[PDB]
Amino acid sequence: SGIFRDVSLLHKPTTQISDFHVATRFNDDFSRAVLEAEVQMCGELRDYLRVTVSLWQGETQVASGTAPFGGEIIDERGGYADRVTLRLNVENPKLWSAEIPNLYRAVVELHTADGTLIEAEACDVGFREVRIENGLLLLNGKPLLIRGVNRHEHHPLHGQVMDEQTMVQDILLMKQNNFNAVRCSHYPNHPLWYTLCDRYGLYVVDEANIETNGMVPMNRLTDDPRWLPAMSERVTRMVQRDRNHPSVIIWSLGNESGHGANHDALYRWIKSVDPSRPVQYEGGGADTTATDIICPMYARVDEDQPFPAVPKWSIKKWLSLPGETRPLILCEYAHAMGNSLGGFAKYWQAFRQYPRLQGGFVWDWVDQSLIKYDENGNPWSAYGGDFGDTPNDRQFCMNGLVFADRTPH
Amino acid sequence: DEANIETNGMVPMNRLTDDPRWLPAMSERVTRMVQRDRNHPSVIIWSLGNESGHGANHDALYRWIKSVDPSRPVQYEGGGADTTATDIICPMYARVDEDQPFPAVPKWSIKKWLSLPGETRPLILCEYAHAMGNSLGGFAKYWQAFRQYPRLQGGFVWDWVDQSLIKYDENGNPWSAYGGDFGDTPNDRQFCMNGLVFADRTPH
Ligand SMILES: [Mg+2]
Ligand SMILES: [Mg+2]
Ligand code: NA
Ligand code: NA
Ligand code: NA
Ligand code: NA
Numbered sequence: 307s308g309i310f311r312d313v314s315l316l317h318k319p320t321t322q323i324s325d326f327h328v329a330t331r332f333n334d335d336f337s338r339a340v341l342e343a344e345v346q347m348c349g350e351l352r353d354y355l356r357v358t359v360s361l362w363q364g365e366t367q368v369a370s371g372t373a374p375f376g377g378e379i380i381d382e383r384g385g386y387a388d389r390v391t392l393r394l395n396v397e398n399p400k401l402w403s404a405e406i407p408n409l410y411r412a413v414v415e416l417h418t419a420d421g422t423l424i425e426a427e428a429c430d431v432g433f434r435e436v437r438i439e440n441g442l443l444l445l446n447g448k449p450l451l452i453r454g455v456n457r458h459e460h461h462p463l464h465g466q467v468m469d470e471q472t473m474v475q476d477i478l479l480m481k482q483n484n485f486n487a488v489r490c491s492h493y494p495n496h497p498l499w500y501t502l503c504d505r506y507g508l509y510v511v512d513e514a515n516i517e518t519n520g521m522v523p524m525n526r527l528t529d530d531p532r533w534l535p536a537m538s539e540r541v542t543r544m545v546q547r548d549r550n551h552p553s554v555i556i557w558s559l560g561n562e563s564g565h566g567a568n569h570d571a572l573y574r575w576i577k578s579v580d581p582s583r584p585v586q587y588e589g590g591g592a593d594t595t596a597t598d599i600i601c602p603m604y605a606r607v608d609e610d611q612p613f614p615a616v617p618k619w620s621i622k623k624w625l626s627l628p629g630e631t632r633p634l635i636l637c638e639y640a641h642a643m644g645n646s647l648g649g650f651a652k653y654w655q656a657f658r659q660y661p662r663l664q665g666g667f668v669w670d671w672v673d674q675s676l677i678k679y680d681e682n683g684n685p686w687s688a689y690g691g692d693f694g695d696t697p698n699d700r701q702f703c704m705n706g707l708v709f710a711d712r713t714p715h
Numbered sequence: 716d717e718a719n720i721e722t723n724g725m726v727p728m729n730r731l732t733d734d735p736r737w738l739p740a741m742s743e744r745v746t747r748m749v750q751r752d753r754n755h756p757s758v759i760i761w762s763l764g765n766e767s768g769h770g771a772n773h774d775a776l777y778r779w780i781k782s783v784d785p786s787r788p789v790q791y792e793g794g795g796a797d798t799t800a801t802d803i804i805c806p807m808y809a810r811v812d813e814d815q816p817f818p819a820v821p822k823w824s825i826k827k828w829l830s831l832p833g834e835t836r837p838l839i840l841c842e843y844a845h846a847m848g849n850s851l852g853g854f855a856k857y858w859q860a861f862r863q864y865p866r867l868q869g870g871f872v873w874d875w876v877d878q879s880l881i882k883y884d885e886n887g888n889p890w891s892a893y894g895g896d897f898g899d900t901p902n903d904r905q906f907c908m909n910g911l912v913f914a915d916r917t918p919h
Pocket of ligand 4 (some may be wrong): 702703704705
């Protein structure tokens, strides 16, 4: 517990940019794109206001558009007079991927038409399209193969406080070890993480901070309408904050909360508000109506585990169950606890062999061990119960490919 | 029940089946079979023939059947086993786990075939586990997969009975003959004996 992320003070003008969303759509071969940026303002709405969105590739301005406020008519009562959408055509855009994280910079200027900049906001833009078609998850029209890992925000000395150095260190090692994707198990991350995955190039699954694993049955709260509002905020505010980051390619509804009607409602909300990214969610059996991707945790390659209600079928058999057509990407596999990863190669052979087997995210990146000091004052790695904590789950907090100080296992 | 149409020896295999001048002759082999056997309950699936590639004549006949007798699915393996002329993926000799990616008509592992992008049909091998000589090695492997995968619905082993013919030696004693044993040439030697049982019905 505590104030474990940054605290800051922001000054905004009375007439200001209150939100902005950037989308990139493409022609059939990705040789042409349209960048569309919807901008909303709060404050003093007057005819002289304008929005200029300019797109830069390095120090070169590749495109720009200026428009007064007032969006298209949307219904019988009119349109959003406090919003404007700029559309910029971009030819032969440099596409973003984890392989080549090409980025442009979009600058959003709120200003008077005669030239006074009120304020400007901006973001890195990655031209990429994410879509599932014919059962496959495609990125820029090509099917991905996710070499993913789940990563908690953990530091042996600072607990859950993240810092730039540490994040960088993890992203370098991930890449140096041929990972191309990370799942935010199981909550939105510190904001700099996204900046870094955008820039270094990692595909990201951004996950709502919703986990009710300990309930009995697990969907007791998620199927309860009285918990819809609390859950809604966790999903909606995440999307509102992270929707312009190219690194985020998939949204997840949370983790181990069973399958409740709240999930269905929220799945739909995202699909309406942000059609650019698939939505996934493993609870309730990993292939529920609340997921665009079959995203089991620990389903084996050839061996079925037919538990009642939420069986974990062999991943190869799961893809072809009668009527199933979705791609399958394990949200968690290859539990790296202690001396483990036995059978890892079996997964990779299947993934390469079956098109719709598109990978998975290893559980997990770093052991959650904490440093304790002995009588002599020498540091030692502690786990569950080492702080008097009880009940506790002992060494179950250490499941990483790397030790808490980033030394590899 | 399978129409008497096989043009395996053409190059390419569908040279006649894709030619409309052969549509009439092919059509009678299909339509006349259906006219004859359509009242038999034992017939559950119609087949457009065998090893004749995939030509437009197959598509035309596939629809004819679907149109006159909606009661039984239509299958046909030619052209890759999963063409538009078949309601069932029905490969011959596709393996359980191993892919055989031949160009144009690959034979995927059956487990994988089921799940190719967009595929939804059931898969029943029209021929598998070629029982020629001392064979049937790996037969359990197919059965374990058919039981584990709902859409893997079995197959037809190749084949029931050895096609050997009886010849008689000088003393008049009979012996089992195969390709070339009658002066026939060219011939394919022992490839006519692929049965689970010998010609006389004794089991292998
Ligand atoms: Mg305990
Ligand atoms: Mg010969
Ligand atoms: Na694959
Ligand atoms: Na754990
Ligand atoms: Na089966
Ligand atoms: Na033969």
